[PDB]
RNA sequence: CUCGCACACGCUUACAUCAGUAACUAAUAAUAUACUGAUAAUUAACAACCAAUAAACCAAAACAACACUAAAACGUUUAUUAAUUACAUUGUUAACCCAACACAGGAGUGCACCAAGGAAAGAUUAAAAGAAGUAAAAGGAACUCGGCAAACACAAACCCCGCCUGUUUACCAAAAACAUCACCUCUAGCAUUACUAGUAUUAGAGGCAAUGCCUGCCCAGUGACACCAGUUUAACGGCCGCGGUAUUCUGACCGUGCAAAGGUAGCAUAAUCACUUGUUCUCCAAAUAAGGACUUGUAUGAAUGGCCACACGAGGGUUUUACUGUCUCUU
RNA sequence: ACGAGCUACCCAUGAGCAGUUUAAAAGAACCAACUCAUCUAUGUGGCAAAAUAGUGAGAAGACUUGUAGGUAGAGGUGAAAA
RNA sequence: ACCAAAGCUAGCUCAACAUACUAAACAAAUACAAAAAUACACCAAAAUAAAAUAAAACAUUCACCUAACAUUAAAGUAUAGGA
């Protein structure tokens, strides 16, 4: 084969030993006595350096297998920055779900009612977009890492103002950079969702089930799509050190034990840095399942069985101009077999909130054709955004 | 087109080309130091 | 002063790697090849020449992979295609009509009768039909593809005698090689690279070629249309 | 050109060149780049109590001088260790093997303030 | 009247307060940012110094929605480690640097063109000559190598050589020279520092210059290859005499000789030895100029390229129109 | 032996090109900053051991430019001007 | 009458003798860009000296020219040289 090393770039091998060391029963004469190099004297051979007392920073890195949690079985870990090729298909396969196009009827009918709209919904959102992209920064062209979290937080505040009309939104609170872990066995291979999230919303009361029993039974006969050349593991991180313990972000007795909404933000200036929309939807599927799986085992036990009371977790992905919406319901814990009841997940793909924005007025032939402000606006994207936020109430 | 200002000062370049460290890295450079020490120079190198 | 070559990466990775131009200067620092330098900055893609390479040694059997996308590689004159299978991805040279969402079979089992020649499959020269167009020729078993990789270049198998295959290189020179070497069926992509026309002197500078020297050299005896018989067949088979 | 016969200090070079003027380091760089100053490396000045101490920086002019006799390693031994050794040998208790009771120390690394390595600054 | 504030690079107290200048420094005097003596000063938040390994990740910056070819600087997260302990060290002035000078020169970035920064005349007289600027009667290139310079002009056309943008003799030549897209010849079957992390649609050693129509004949010599016969000129190079012949002129033709073949197509008094101011026509009142033809150029000529054309030119030559102190002729 | 802090070329790492005309960021066009130096006049121990004034060519590219590194005299480098 | 003129020390040269030959100063900092207390290394090397000149040119040759252990003689002798 063609090994990728280069002789010049690789570290040189040690120089050949002097001929004196090859003579049996002959003590070589070295310059180690004078502790400096001298021509004509043999080069000493020293034993490996052994510091009597260990020092934290300057010691060599311990081997991986020295860690107490090291295990022979290879566990696959999915953190935030893992990319899946067949994002919708791999996430569906690893989670044993059935993709249903369109938001659930409870969510969609919760936004079409005019009695659930903020005052000046059209105007305020238009101000929110302008504030996010042009007004919030002193610079003329704000970068994406600045206006990606601003636009999401601004829209959260708009739907937060509905607490006066619905005095039950006070049961929610946000959490930041929590540590989440959920390990499950899936067809003779071990998977684990480990890492953090952008923004998390938790509520005191659990979210009611959203799928009718007719759809759950229809899920039994659904067969998961398969792809032969690509293994389902591809895209994950193979870790030999791990702990088999489903650890959520909070300790026992937390007054907000039921997660409600996950906010994933792809904020990065460069195009290759950000997730593709297909891969971004995969990121939401697994993390929404990991939070759902943690509740399903904390509230019921480590035993794997079908859940009589489903757990519902929502998640919203944002690019700064394009949105992704996901509502996931968890029904099955025994994921080893593929013949039982599958889970459900409603996904709306590529909800375009606005087409384009012009920070500066474009001038063609000394006249203004398109003034400053967003071009094209779809209020339904925010209307669906408002629907998910008010789902609990 | 108007010569005479060929010397553009720079401390990074001056200490890298005529520095004391460079003079002691080449066998010919060390002989330069030896000649200036023998002659009695006040400054062996930059 | 001795310089350091940029080819220091040890582990294969599909993502583009940083690249430093040379300009014809050797490690010493003197010009050795003229007319090179001042090109557009480029990134290098790690190309996997060895078509047959199992993920693990537990299962040495033939495996089948899937093509994801076909991209443009600034370094070589051909087009490379991303290929994924199992738990790894590879950049391999795409043939004439390789597209996205396609399946490519890699195998080494030398069968007696034959194997149907597809446009992307890689099979040993012992199982291919006599009249097959091939590229990425492996000179020795396990050495890797070295020959026939330029754009639009395809070699044709001639005959298989006493367990040894003879192929025709694009230079119309016959080459003898053991039949167990892996080769790819088809013609290399970007067929009309030869018909590309450079519109101005600047486009040469963008590619990275400096203009020739202005010294006027009188032609010697080397010039003139030379008619020479074809050199004999080059054989890499070691006869015991 | 430039002056090659002057002192090369931190003020002459660019912003990259920052050479200390001779101070002793008191720490290192931490994780975030904030300078972590080690408490031990700071020289803790030790001072006595001069309130109940009667002595002045000047001596009276009428006070006589003395014959300048520099202290000798031989004179110190005859003053401190000789009386102890002499009495023990006359009583028959002298032990040539062990001399630790007379103030001799075989290895310096045991004690806090070595002598040949010169552990203490002053 | 307008190159102003600040940082980087550089210089190194030349900066500040007070006092002195008979003399030293300023190309003079007053005088003191520039000469002498004493004293004093730049305080970190800004800037320098400011972790390692393993793993996941094919998807450009141009308001970036999405695309082009020349394929593009710009990283996050998970895992294993990382002395944990107020106050560390260092750069903070300036009218400044490189050019022998307190030099009309050279000098990167940000923001302004000012709210900031500065003084063309030491005092007179108002000669010639010289430099720079404005105006002019009638004429408008009659000046002169040339319309150089100047102008209330700021247009039109022909030709020669190069196709074009570009490049070169820093400090007498910026061109018709070199490069260049195109075409063609030649040498190479391939691995860890160039060529190349490439593999004959590739890469080097060269010639000639886009395009269009073409690139004729010649391996005798030399060179190269074959390394033998031999093969090669888009390899170096070459590509003919004498005599007679249709009334006269011309010479289709014929005799004879030598060669490896005897200059083919084209163009042409040309940037092409001399003859030469060839001859003729057009342009002008007048033409050694310019364009168009005639043409043995016995020394034009076909990739050491011939020929034709669009576009282009601070190249070279000519004509018309408009302007003007170039000039009649200076004030 | 010492020299690539000027210059020829290259490898790194950075930074500039406003307005105007066009489906054009097209080695297109008008014109600044910026970079070269065509023609003439002053200057000729000069302000200057190659400059000043007027006028000019390019000005989204084979373009200018800062920092730093590489090639050294039987050589380096060269869009050949010895 | 100005500008000027005069002085005799500083030290040096060549030997001899001679110990036997990198002085004086080294508290701290000195081969990071020397004079900057403090971190996992790489370290190092040799290949005949050539020519200016003489032979009235210049190609074989051209004393001394790095390494001889001296002096009185043998002797500018034997020999080696485009002899
Ligand atoms: K290519
Ligand atoms: K200074
Ligand atoms: K004339
Ligand atoms: K020019
Ligand atoms: K021949
Ligand atoms: K003519
Ligand atoms: K020109
Ligand atoms: K250098
Ligand atoms: K000047
Ligand atoms: Mg000089
Ligand atoms: Mg410079
Ligand atoms: Mg290349
Ligand atoms: Mg060429
Ligand atoms: Mg040429
Ligand atoms: Mg000097
Ligand atoms: Mg400095
Ligand atoms: Mg500075
Ligand atoms: Mg601190
Ligand atoms: Mg100075
Ligand atoms: Mg003055
Ligand atoms: Mg004063
Ligand atoms: Mg002063
Ligand atoms: Mg002067
Ligand atoms: Mg004045
Ligand atoms: Mg005057
Ligand atoms: Mg006058
Ligand atoms: Mg006038
Ligand atoms: Mg008049
Ligand atoms: Mg006339
Ligand atoms: Mg006349
Ligand atoms: Mg002339
Ligand atoms: Mg003129
Ligand atoms: Mg002519
Ligand atoms: Mg030209
Ligand atoms: Mg022409
Ligand atoms: Mg030009
Ligand atoms: Mg010149
Ligand atoms: Mg120039
Ligand atoms: Mg000139
Ligand atoms: Mg042709
Ligand atoms: Mg041509
Ligand atoms: Mg040419
Ligand atoms: Mg020509
Ligand atoms: Mg020919
Ligand atoms: Mg022959
Ligand atoms: Mg003609
Ligand atoms: Mg002609
Ligand atoms: Mg003539
Ligand atoms: Mg003429
Ligand atoms: Mg005339
Ligand atoms: Mg003519
Ligand atoms: Mg001729
Ligand atoms: Mg020829
Ligand atoms: Mg000719
Ligand atoms: Mg053209
Ligand atoms: Mg012209
Ligand atoms: Mg006229
Ligand atoms: Mg340089
Ligand atoms: Mg512009
Ligand atoms: Mg242009
Ligand atoms: Mg000028
Ligand atoms: Mg001028
Ligand atoms: Mg004028
Ligand atoms: Mg112009
Ligand atoms: Mg132009
Ligand atoms: Mg050197
Ligand atoms: Mg040379
Ligand atoms: Mg050049
Ligand atoms: Mg020439
Ligand atoms: Mg010449
Ligand atoms: Mg001689
Ligand atoms: Mg003589
Ligand atoms: Mg000699
Ligand atoms: Mg003889």
PDB file of C-alpha atoms in Angstrom, chain C residues 25-120:
ATOM      1  CA  UNK C  25      12.931  25.081  -5.149  1.00  0.00           C
ATOM      2  CA  UNK C  26      14.410  21.909  -3.667  1.00  0.00           C
ATOM      3  CA  UNK C  27      15.103  21.436   0.047  1.00  0.00           C
ATOM      4  CA  UNK C  28      18.362  23.380  -0.322  1.00  0.00           C
ATOM      5  CA  UNK C  29      16.566  26.429  -1.713  1.00  0.00           C
ATOM      6  CA  UNK C  30      17.781  26.581  -5.314  1.00  0.00           C
ATOM      7  CA  UNK C  31      15.691  26.385  -8.470  1.00  0.00           C
ATOM      8  CA  UNK C  32      15.583  22.884  -9.947  1.00  0.00           C
ATOM      9  CA  UNK C  33      12.420  22.984 -12.095  1.00  0.00           C
ATOM     10  CA  UNK C  34      11.719  26.254 -13.899  1.00  0.00           C
ATOM     11  CA  UNK C  35       8.382  27.786 -14.807  1.00  0.00           C
ATOM     12  CA  UNK C  36       6.564  26.885 -11.575  1.00  0.00           C
ATOM     13  CA  UNK C  37       5.313  29.334  -8.968  1.00  0.00           C
ATOM     14  CA  UNK C  38       2.809  32.050  -8.184  1.00  0.00           C
ATOM     15  CA  UNK C  39      -0.390  30.017  -8.427  1.00  0.00           C
ATOM     16  CA  UNK C  40      -3.750  30.233  -6.704  1.00  0.00           C
ATOM     17  CA  UNK C  41      -3.857  28.779  -3.200  1.00  0.00           C
ATOM     18  CA  UNK C  42      -5.074  25.179  -3.076  1.00  0.00           C
ATOM     19  CA  UNK C  43      -6.071  22.502  -0.572  1.00  0.00           C
ATOM     20  CA  UNK C  44      -5.196  18.825  -0.959  1.00  0.00           C
ATOM     21  CA  UNK C  45      -7.660  15.935  -0.704  1.00  0.00           C
ATOM     22  CA  UNK C  46      -6.337  12.629   0.627  1.00  0.00           C
ATOM     23  CA  UNK C  47      -6.886  10.228  -2.290  1.00  0.00           C
ATOM     24  CA  UNK C  48      -7.105   6.497  -1.557  1.00  0.00           C
ATOM     25  CA  UNK C  49      -5.435   4.793  -4.521  1.00  0.00           C
ATOM     26  CA  UNK C  50      -5.807   1.204  -3.284  1.00  0.00           C
ATOM     27  CA  UNK C  51      -9.336   0.277  -4.356  1.00  0.00           C
ATOM     28  CA  UNK C  52      -9.431  -2.976  -2.362  1.00  0.00           C
ATOM     29  CA  UNK C  53      -8.956  -2.185   1.339  1.00  0.00           C
ATOM     30  CA  UNK C  54     -11.249  -3.866   3.886  1.00  0.00           C
ATOM     31  CA  UNK C  55     -12.199  -1.990   7.036  1.00  0.00           C
ATOM     32  CA  UNK C  56     -11.101  -4.924   9.214  1.00  0.00           C
ATOM     33  CA  UNK C  57      -9.044  -8.053   8.627  1.00  0.00           C
ATOM     34  CA  UNK C  58     -11.752 -10.214  10.234  1.00  0.00           C
ATOM     35  CA  UNK C  59     -13.755 -10.312   6.971  1.00  0.00           C
ATOM     36  CA  UNK C  60     -11.442 -10.187   3.924  1.00  0.00           C
ATOM     37  CA  UNK C  61     -14.355 -10.781   1.548  1.00  0.00           C
ATOM     38  CA  UNK C  62     -15.454  -8.456  -1.243  1.00  0.00           C
ATOM     39  CA  UNK C  63     -17.375  -5.373  -0.154  1.00  0.00           C
ATOM     40  CA  UNK C  64     -19.686  -2.898  -1.872  1.00  0.00           C
ATOM     41  CA  UNK C  65     -19.707   0.862  -1.314  1.00  0.00           C
ATOM     42  CA  UNK C  66     -21.923   3.831  -2.162  1.00  0.00           C
ATOM     43  CA  UNK C  67     -21.018   7.039  -3.998  1.00  0.00           C
ATOM     44  CA  UNK C  68     -22.120  10.235  -2.252  1.00  0.00           C
ATOM     45  CA  UNK C  69     -20.893  13.094  -4.430  1.00  0.00           C
ATOM     46  CA  UNK C  70     -18.502  13.896  -7.270  1.00  0.00           C
ATOM     47  CA  UNK C  71     -16.305  16.945  -6.684  1.00  0.00           C
ATOM     48  CA  UNK C  72     -13.588  18.888  -8.501  1.00  0.00           C
ATOM     49  CA  UNK C  73     -10.001  18.345  -7.358  1.00  0.00           C
ATOM     50  CA  UNK C  74      -7.620  21.260  -8.044  1.00  0.00           C
ATOM     51  CA  UNK C  75      -4.493  19.086  -7.854  1.00  0.00           C
ATOM     52  CA  UNK C  76      -5.180  16.405 -10.461  1.00  0.00           C
ATOM     53  CA  UNK C  77      -6.712  16.898 -13.903  1.00  0.00           C
ATOM     54  CA  UNK C  78      -9.507  14.388 -13.190  1.00  0.00           C
ATOM     55  CA  UNK C  79     -12.574  14.495 -10.941  1.00  0.00           C
ATOM     56  CA  UNK C  80     -12.662  12.687  -7.607  1.00  0.00           C
ATOM     57  CA  UNK C  81     -15.740  11.148  -5.998  1.00  0.00           C
ATOM     58  CA  UNK C  82     -16.543  10.649  -2.327  1.00  0.00           C
ATOM     59  CA  UNK C  83     -17.278   7.004  -1.508  1.00  0.00           C
ATOM     60  CA  UNK C  84     -18.544   5.737   1.851  1.00  0.00           C
ATOM     61  CA  UNK C  85     -18.932   2.198   3.143  1.00  0.00           C
ATOM     62  CA  UNK C  86     -19.108   0.595   6.565  1.00  0.00           C
ATOM     63  CA  UNK C  87     -17.672   3.173   8.972  1.00  0.00           C
ATOM     64  CA  UNK C  88     -15.228   5.083   6.737  1.00  0.00           C
ATOM     65  CA  UNK C  89     -15.205   7.369   3.703  1.00  0.00           C
ATOM     66  CA  UNK C  90     -12.681   7.527   0.868  1.00  0.00           C
ATOM     67  CA  UNK C  91     -11.782   9.868  -1.984  1.00  0.00           C
ATOM     68  CA  UNK C  92     -11.323   7.772  -5.131  1.00  0.00           C
ATOM     69  CA  UNK C  93     -10.977   8.800  -8.762  1.00  0.00           C
ATOM     70  CA  UNK C  94     -14.351   8.901 -10.505  1.00  0.00           C
ATOM     71  CA  UNK C  95     -14.831   7.270 -13.900  1.00  0.00           C
ATOM     72  CA  UNK C  96     -16.492   8.823 -16.952  1.00  0.00           C
ATOM     73  CA  UNK C  97     -20.133   8.749 -15.783  1.00  0.00           C
ATOM     74  CA  UNK C  98     -20.073   8.304 -12.006  1.00  0.00           C
ATOM     75  CA  UNK C  99     -22.803  10.322 -10.287  1.00  0.00           C
ATOM     76  CA  UNK C 100     -24.331  10.740  -6.846  1.00  0.00           C
ATOM     77  CA  UNK C 101     -26.370   7.967  -5.262  1.00  0.00           C
ATOM     78  CA  UNK C 102     -24.525   5.153  -7.027  1.00  0.00           C
ATOM     79  CA  UNK C 103     -23.210   1.815  -5.777  1.00  0.00           C
ATOM     80  CA  UNK C 104     -19.675   0.589  -6.510  1.00  0.00           C
ATOM     81  CA  UNK C 105     -18.480  -2.989  -5.989  1.00  0.00           C
ATOM     82  CA  UNK C 106     -14.896  -3.810  -4.997  1.00  0.00           C
ATOM     83  CA  UNK C 107     -13.770  -7.424  -5.272  1.00  0.00           C
ATOM     84  CA  UNK C 108     -10.655  -9.550  -5.677  1.00  0.00           C
ATOM     85  CA  UNK C 109     -12.025 -13.092  -6.145  1.00  0.00           C
ATOM     86  CA  UNK C 110     -10.536 -14.400  -9.401  1.00  0.00           C
ATOM     87  CA  UNK C 111     -13.290 -16.529 -10.935  1.00  0.00           C
ATOM     88  CA  UNK C 112     -12.758 -19.040 -13.714  1.00  0.00           C
ATOM     89  CA  UNK C 113     -15.440 -18.078 -16.271  1.00  0.00           C
ATOM     90  CA  UNK C 114     -15.795 -14.277 -16.057  1.00  0.00           C
ATOM     91  CA  UNK C 115     -17.371 -11.329 -14.246  1.00  0.00           C
ATOM     92  CA  UNK C 116     -19.557  -8.695 -15.918  1.00  0.00           C
ATOM     93  CA  UNK C 117     -17.651  -5.430 -16.315  1.00  0.00           C
ATOM     94  CA  UNK C 118     -19.509  -2.459 -14.851  1.00  0.00           C
ATOM     95  CA  UNK C 119     -18.509   1.194 -15.152  1.00  0.00           C
ATOM     96  CA  UNK C 120     -17.299   1.552 -11.557  1.00  0.00           C
TER      97      UNK C 120
END
